[PDB]
Structures are given as C-alpha cells and as structure tokens.
Structure 1
Amino acid sequence: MIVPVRCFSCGKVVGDKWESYLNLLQEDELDEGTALSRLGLKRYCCRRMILTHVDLIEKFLRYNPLEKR
C-alpha cells in the first residue's frame, strides 16, 4: 500500500527513496535502472523494492469519511 521502510531481504532503508524515485522518473527523463542506481540501490533485492512498489495508498486516500465529497 505504502512504501516499505526497509528492504525485505537485506534490511536497507528504502522508505525514503520512493518520492525521489518518482521525481527522477518524472522531472529527469531517467529510465528505471538509472534512477535506481542513482538512488544508491545496487543489490537487486533493494532494487525490486522500489521498482515494483504499487503505491495503493493514494487510491485508498480518495475514500475519506471525514471530509465532504
């Protein structure tokens, strides 16, 4: 749903890199491998954690029971 704090396999903190990954994908015209490398993700265990994240939290957040729609 929301980005995991750490990589499952090794434990490297990858929770602070999802927004940067999106920025490097959108603003810069970087491919996914280049963006992951420039974030500091060398092991494929760490690369998959960001390369394959879905970010369903944004779709969950549109159903807000506390604000008039």
Structure 2
Amino acid sequence: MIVPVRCFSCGKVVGDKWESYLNLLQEDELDEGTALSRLGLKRYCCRRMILTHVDLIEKFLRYNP
C-alpha cells in the first residue's frame, strides 16, 4: 500500500521518507540498516515500517482509467 502516515508506535512521520528511500535503494543499493540510518530511524520499532512495508499501488495503477 502506501507507507503509513505516522509509524504507529512513535507517530513520527515516515511517509515523507519513501520516495527518497526508494531512490536511495535504486540509486545506491546499500545495506538497508545503513540506509535507514541515513534516513534516521534510530529505534527498531520504527525502523520496521520502512524495512517491512510493501507497496501494491503500482500493481493497482497498472489497470485502467
């Protein structure tokens, strides 16, 4: 889906970080523990949101107007 606004435990927004993290992975391909350390989620219970979250929006938007 979309990455959730305000990663549920903390509630710090991380849905800003998705496109920058997307280009960070596609552009540099590091270990994602370091990639999220660059985008700065220090606690693992909020690191889980970007490490986990699956998008299905593109496979949704392939379909039709």
Same fold by TM (over 0.5)? yes
Rg larger in structure:
1
| Structure 1, 19-28 or 51-60: larger mean CA deviation | 19-28
Deviations 1:2-26 (A, max 9, x none): 1111111110100001111111111
How far residue 29 of structure 1 moved from its aligned partner, in angstroms, is 2.9
TM-score, structure 2 normalization:
0.90
Aligned length: 65
How far residue 64 of structure 1 moved from its aligned partner, in angstroms, is 1.8
Q: CA RMSD in A?
A: 1.0
**Among the aligned pairs, what percent are the same residue?**
100
Moved over 2 A (4+): none
How far residue 61 of structure 1 moved from its aligned partner, in angstroms, is 0.7
Residue equivalent to 2:21: 21
Task: Work out the CA distance in 2 between the residues paired with 1:18 and 1:8.
Answer: 16
- Residue 27 of structure 1 aligns to a residue in which SS? helix
TM-score, structure 1 normalization:
0.85
Structure 2, gaps ≥5 residues long: none
